[model samples]
Target: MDSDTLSGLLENVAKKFPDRRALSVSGKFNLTHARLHDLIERAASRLVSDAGIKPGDVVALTFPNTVEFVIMFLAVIRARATAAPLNAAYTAEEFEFYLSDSDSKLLLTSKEGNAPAQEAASKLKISHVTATLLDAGSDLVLSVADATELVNHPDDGALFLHTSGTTSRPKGVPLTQLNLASSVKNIKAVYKLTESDSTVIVLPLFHVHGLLAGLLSSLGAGAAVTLPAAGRFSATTFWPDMKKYNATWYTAVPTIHQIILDRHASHPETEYPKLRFIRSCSASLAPVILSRLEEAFGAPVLEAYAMTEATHLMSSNPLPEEGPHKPGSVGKPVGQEMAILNEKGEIQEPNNKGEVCIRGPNVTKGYKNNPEANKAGFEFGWFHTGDIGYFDTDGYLHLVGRIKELINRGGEKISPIEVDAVLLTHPDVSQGVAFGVPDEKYGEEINCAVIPREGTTVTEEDIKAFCKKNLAAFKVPKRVFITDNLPKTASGKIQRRIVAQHFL
Candidate 1:
C-alpha cells in the first residue's frame, strides 16, 4: 500500500498489526489498530455523507488532546480534507483571525464546545458542530451532516497550521500528505519506534511537536499512544498513566520536564517504570535539566530541534546504540539537509554562527496566501528558519539565538509584533512595544511598554487586564510598563532593542 498519505499509513499499520493496541484515553477506552482504523473510516464516511465535506475543504478543530480529536483529525485527512487544529485557550479575537485566515468551511469541537471558537465561527458564518463518540469502540458522532470525498494522495494538503513570524500577521503553513509521511518516517527512524513501544503524550495536539512527534509518528510506527483522561497534561497523573500503559518512551518540552523533575524531587516514587529514553524539543533543554532527568528517570535524554514549517522533525540526538548524545546540542540532521549559511546564503565554516537553513521533502512548499512571507522565507533554494546557530566539530547543532526577535517562553513562540498590535488596540494606549526578557523558570517572558494617551491614565494593571481579555495567556505580557516616551533609533523609528535596553 502507498504509505505517503496519512490514511494509507494507518491502513498499512492496521493490516500489519490489526490486534495491537493503537490508542487509549487514560481511564477511558482502549482501541486496537483494527478498531482505530475502523473508527476513522466510520467518521470519515460520516463527514462526507452528512457534512458534504468535499476534497480540500478546510476543517477547523478546537478540541483538546482526546481520542475524539485523534479520530476527527485523521478522519478529516482521510476524507481528503485539511485539518486545522487551533489552541482551545485562544480568545475570541484570536480564534476569529485563525478561522478566517484558514478559510475554514467547518468547525468541530468536543461535546463541551468552545465558546470562543463558536463565537468566531458564528461571526465568520462557518458551520460549527459538536463531535463525540457515545461509548467505547463506538462510531464517531457529529452534530453536522455526514460528509466525504475519500483517501488523499501524496501531494494533497492534509494539515494547515499557523506560525508566528517577526511581523504582525501569523503566516499559514500547509503541509501535504507527503510532508507528513516524510516527517513521520524521520521521527520513527530517529527514535526507533515500533509496535511494542508505548508513549504518553504530554503536549497539546494543536502544535506540531505534539501532533507529529508524539501522536502521528507513534501511530505511523504502529506504537501505542495514551492521552490523558483530563484532556490535557497533568503533573500529578503523569507517571501513573505511563506506568499503567507500560509506556517505553515519551516526548515533551523542557518546561514539562522541569515540572516532572520538581514533582519527583518533592515526592519521590517507590517504584518507577523503566523508560527506554526521553525526548525533549520545542525549546532548548538546559544541560542541568538534562542531567537531572537522566539521574531521576534512569533513561537517556535526547534533545531535538524542530519547527512548524519542517513538519516537526528537523534534527534529533541519536540513541545510545547509534552514538553518544550531546548535552547542549540538538544532534544531527535527521533525513534532511541542514546548513548554517551567512547573509549571502553561503555555507558557513564549522563553529561559525549563521542562519539555519533547511531543504528537504518534509519542509512545506511555502506559506499559504503569503507571497511576501514565502519569498522572504524561501531563499537560496532553502527555507530559512530565522534562527542563529552553528554546527560543532562533532556535527551537532547548537542554537545561539534568534535572528528575528521572537520570544521563546517555554517553547511557546510569541511574536512581539502580535503583542504590540494587541497593546495598541487599547483606547488609552497611544504607542506600545513588546519585547522578551530573560526569566529563571520560563527561559523568556514577555514584557510590554505603552505610552498612554495624553489625557488618559492607564495603569500597568489596566493594560494587563486589557491584554488578558484579548490575548491568550501565553501571549499576554507578564509585566506592563507605563512610560511617557520610548527610545527610538536615528531614523525616528522605535527599535525593540533600544526600548528594551532603555527599560532594563
Candidate 2:
C-alpha cells in the first residue's frame, strides 16, 4: 500500500512528472506536476490567509469540469478542511438542503458559471468564495474573507459526500484522507495506468467516478486527464477531444457510452487511432451494447464495480495482458476485500446470488451523523453495497440487481422518495408515488403518479411543470400519471413494486 494520503500521492507524482502535463480544462489550465504542486501550495496558503479557514473546517464546492474546480478541491484538502463537492445541476432546494446539512463552514463556487450554488449560499447567509482568475483564466488564485478545528487522526474526513440513504434523507459520508488515497492507488493499479497514459473525463467531478476514478487515479500514475466543456457525454465531441489530446482511454457510465453509440450509429466506423481502451462504471452496460462499443471503437471495454462507501472502485476488469474479461462481469476485487453476503449475514458460496459486501482501507468507517444508517449499512465489518451480485466459476463478479430503490438515470442516482416528496408539494395533489421504469438508453427513467384533490383541477402536465422547477432535470418524472387514488387498499401500505406494475 502506498498509503491513503492525497498529498503524499501528489508529491510522488511531482517528483516524477514535474514538467509533464497532468491536467487540462476547457482549453485552459494545463499544468505540469511541479506547477500543480505550487498552485496547490499557493491555493492552500490563501485558504488559511485570506479565507480564514482552520484545519478541520468543512467547505462545499460546486462547479463544472474546469481547472478551477480541481484547484479548489485540492485547496480544501491542502488547507486540511473537509472538501464536499456539490452537484451543480442540483435545484436550489436541493442545493440549499445539502449545503446546510453538510455543516459547511464556507461555500466555494465558480466565479462565473455556478449560479445555483451561489444563490443557495446567499439564501442561507453563508459566505461564498471563488478563485480569482489570472493569466487569461489559465491560473486560478483562491482567497477568502475568512480556523482552529484540529485533526489528530488521518481517518478524519477529507471529503464530505452524501450517499443514497435508506430513504429520501441522504447520509453524508466522510471519506478519510486514507480512504480516498487507498482507492486512488487501487484504481491506478487495476487499470495498470502510467505516466504514458492520458484520460478524457466526461463524468461529473462531484461523483466518485470522476474524482477517485477519473482524477485521483491518473494523478497516482503521474498521467494526464482532460476535462472537456461540452458537458456530460457529447457524442459529437468525444473522439475529436480524444484525438486532440492523443488520449489513451476514458471512463464513464453505461448511459454515456450508449449515447455515443446512438449518436454514432450511422458513423459506426469512427475510430481513434491513438485511443487504447474504454472504461464503464456506475450502471450496467447491456451485453449487446458492450459488443457494439468494442466493435465501434475497436477497443477493449472494461467494466468496474464501485460504490460511494468504497471511495470509488473496488474491482475492475484488467487490461489485455492480465486475463479474460467477461462482458457483464465487473471483474475481481482490485485492492479491497469483498464477499457475497447471504440474507442471514453469512458469506455465500460462489455463484450464489446475494448482496455485495466489501471492507477495506478504501472504504469509509461510517457516515457522518448517521449512526442508524451505519448500523443498517454495515454488517459483520462489511459495508453492504446494497447491490446484488455474485462471483462466477472463474471468479469474475456479475451484478444481478439492487436491494434499494435508487433509480439510476443513466448514472445519476435519484431517490424515489425525493421525487415523491416533490410531487406532493403541488396543491392539487393529495397523494403521490414515484418509482423507476426500465429504459434502454438511460438504464432507468423516473415515473410518478399522484392522486388528485377532490375539488381541484390539475393535469399531469401541471405536475411535471412544477417538478421541472424543483427537481434536477434527470429527476423530473418522465411520465406523470394522474390517478383517482393510489393502487392500494385503505388499510394497506403502498407498495412501490405494485405501483410500478399497475402504472409502469
Candidate 3:
C-alpha cells in the first residue's frame, strides 16, 4: 500500500503514466496524466499567489461535474489548503451556512457554475475568485491569478465535507491527505482497479463518492476516466453520449440506475469488452433493483456502505467470482477495521444488532470544533457510524437503519429500510421511502411515500394489500403517499428524516 499523502499519490501516478489519458469530457476536453499534474501545478501556484491562500486555509470550491471542478480541487489540496467543495445547486442560505461553518478563507467558482456562492462569500466577508479555462481547449489548463510556495504537511486537511444535514445542522468534516489517500488505495485494491480499467465520472464531484471513489481512485490506479456533461442526468441520451467514451464501469446512486432502467426498455449494446461492474453506494438499493440493473447492463452490481467521515467507501461487494453478491449486504470492510457495538460500546457477536463502528487509516479523526458531535461520533477509540446493522455468519454486513431513523411506534421499533424493500417488491412501485410521521395515536404512525412507475396507476389500497401480504400488519405502512418524486438531498440521498420534512 502507498500510505502516502494525497499530494504524494498524485505525483507518483503522473510519473507512472504520463502519456496515458487520465481525464476527458467527451469531444470537448481531455488531459493526459502528465498534463493533469502540470495543470494542477500551475493552478495551485496561481491560487496561492493571487488568492493569498495559505497551507491551512480552507478554500471553498463551487462547480458542477466539469473538468474545472476536478482541477480546482486537486490544485487546492496540492497547494496544502483544505478543499471545501460546496454543491453547485445550493441556495444562498445553504451556501452561507456551509461557508460560514467551514470558516472558509476563499471561495472559488466559475461563471459556468454557481453565482450564489459569490453573494454568500461576500455576505460572510470572505474573498471569492472566479475561474476561466485557458485557450487551446484540448488539454485541461486554467488561467487563475498567480501565487508562491508551500510546505506540504501530511497531517494537514486535504478535504472538508459536511454531514447531509437532513436530521440536523450539517457539521464540518475535515479529512487529511492521509485519510483520502488511504481510502483511494483501499477502493482501488478492493475493486481490483488497474490502468486497463476505466469508469465514467457520472456522479457529482462535490461529494466524496465521485471525488474519491470515482475520480481519485481511478487516477491512483492509472485508469482512464470520462466526465459526462454537467446538466440534469438524462437517461434517454446517457448511453449514446457515453458509448464513445468506452468506459468499463461507473459508480452511482440507486436513483441513477433506476432512471437508466426506465428509459432502457431493452438491453443496449456496449463496446467495452473489459467492462467489469457498476458500484452502488450512499443509499440502500432494493434487491429487485439490484438484479434488474445487472440484467440490464450484463454487469454485476456492487453495493457499498459510505459516509462523509469515512471518505466515501467503507466496504463493497466483491467481483462476481470472489463471493456471492448478497442483495441486502454492504459486503465486508475493505481497508478499515469494523465491529458492531451495543449500547455500552461493547463489541457484539455476529447476528447481534448494534451500531456499526469503523477505525482505520481511511477514517477521519473527528469533526471540526464540534465537541458534542465528536464525542457522540467517537467512542472507545472507534468512530460509531450511527448505523444499525448486523454481520451475517458469512461475514457480510447487513444494515437495518440509522439509530435515529428507527421509528418508535409506541415502543415497537421499525426499520424504514425494511419497509422500503418490501414496498419496492410491488409491481407498480418504482421508488419509495418510509418515514415516521407525527401522530397522536400509537405515538407515531408510519407513512410511506412512493413514486409509481411512469404510466402506472397505483392506489393506496394496492400498496396496503401488497405490504400486508409480505410484511406484518403492524409493519405495514399506515399511510401511502403516491407522488411523482421523493425529495433528495443535494447528493441525491433520500434520508428517512428528510422524507418527513418533504411530506409533512
* Clash count of each predicted structure: 12, 5, 3
**How many Å off is the CA of 195 in candidate 2?**
0.5
lDDT at 421, model 2: 54
TM-score against truth, every candidate: 0.81, 0.78, 0.94
RMSD values for the candidates in order, in angstroms, are: 10.8, 11.0, 2.3
Report residue 478 deviation for candidate 1 (angstroms).
20
Error of 2 at 200 (Å): 1.2
Using lDDT as the yardstick, the better of models 2 and 3 is: 3
Q: What is the lDDT of candidate 1?
A: 0.86
Candidate 3 C-alpha lDDT tens digits along 1-504: 264688787788888889888888766767888888888887888777767778889999988777777888989998899999888878898899889888899888875546678788888898877666655444334434332346566788899998877656677899999898889999998899888777777677888888898899999888888877653355655675556776788888887777777767654545323458888998888899898888777888899999998988988888888887899889999988899999987889999999999998888889999999888888766898889999999889999988877888888888888999898889888899899887797888888998898789999999999999998788888888888977676677887776677678
Best-to-worst order by lDDT is 1, 3, 2
Deviation of model 2 at 471, angstroms: 36
Error of 1 at 123 (Å): 1.8
lDDT of prediction 2: 0.77
Candidate 2 per-residue lDDT over residues 190-292, each given as its tens digit: 8888888897787788888888888888877888988886544457777777777778988877656755766676564345654567898875655655787
Q: Which stretches of candidate 3 lie over 4 Å from their true place?
A: 111-113, 135-151, 266-274, 439-441, 501-504
What are the per-residue Cα lDDT tens digits for candidate 1 across 280-375?
Answer: 987666666788799999999999999889999899999999998987789999999999999988899899988999999899999998899889
For residue 427, model 3's alpha carbon misses the true position, in angstroms, by: 1.1
